[PDB]
Ligand SMILES: Nc1ncnc2c1ncn2[C@@H]1O[C@H](COP(=O)(O)OP(=O)(O)O)[C@@H](O)[C@H]1O
Ligand SMILES: Nc1ncnc2c1ncn2[C@@H]1O[C@H](COP(=O)(O)O)[C@@H](O)[C@H]1O
Ligand code: ALF
């Protein structure tokens with residue numbers, strides 16, 4: 098089974114993907130997590146991607162396409178979390194998979210309004226050593242866990258990221274609808290309820 102999680106920044110895609118992957122054995126491919134690792138390591142990819150990410154812009158397609166060619170699991174279940182994020186990325190994914198006799202089985206759209214997105218992102222905090230994600234209101238970190246606010250979760254950068262999503266990523270909703278594989282979830286609900294809806298799709 099190959100899944101794509103699609104939706105605005107802060108919709109809860111990572112939160113749900115991490116759980117589904119552990120509980121059901123999917124390989125989790127988060128382009129954001131992988132890119133943040135590259136930046137830390139200072140690889141050619143990381144050094145180039147950094148300033149796009151800091152501005153809330155997308156990293157250029159060719160870099161992301163190469164990244165996915167390099168890490169795409171040969172066999173077994175996969176969740177692509179935050180990839181694809183452009184039409185050209187989605188076209189590349191389809192081509193890659195077809196060469197392997199595979200296809201995307203379901204694309205889960207995490208629907209949530211802007212006001213909710215903005216609250217989730219402005220209260221998001223991360224453990225920079227593990228990538229674990231918390232929320233100051235909805236899931237605060239316990240004692241002993243040092244967390245930070247991502248630079249891209251600043252108010253002006255959140256604004257830009259939502260703009261970028263609407264212009265470049267939201268067209269994927271129609272791209273996948275027209276493949277017959279889009280499934281809608283209400284990602285504005287609390288975490289447990291979102292997860293129930295995820296399980297319903299993949300079942
Ligand atoms: N259903 C939910 N309700 C409330 N807060 C949530 C929910 N899902 C995730 N969060 C919190 O909202 C923020 C965004 O979640 P995250 O999984 O990082 O989203 P994404 O991967 O889509 O950008 C995080 O701070 C997370 O703790
Ligand atoms: N598929 C992608 N294409 C382009 N840039 C991406 C992609 N995934 C992550 N990014 C970059 O990483 C940032 C964080 O994304 P994420 O961690 O998925 O919320 C984005 O705002 C982009 O700068
Ligand atoms: F996957 Al995001 F901000 F959209 F961590």
Ligand SMILES: [Mg+2]
Nearest residue numbers: 110111129179
């Ligand atoms: Mg994420």
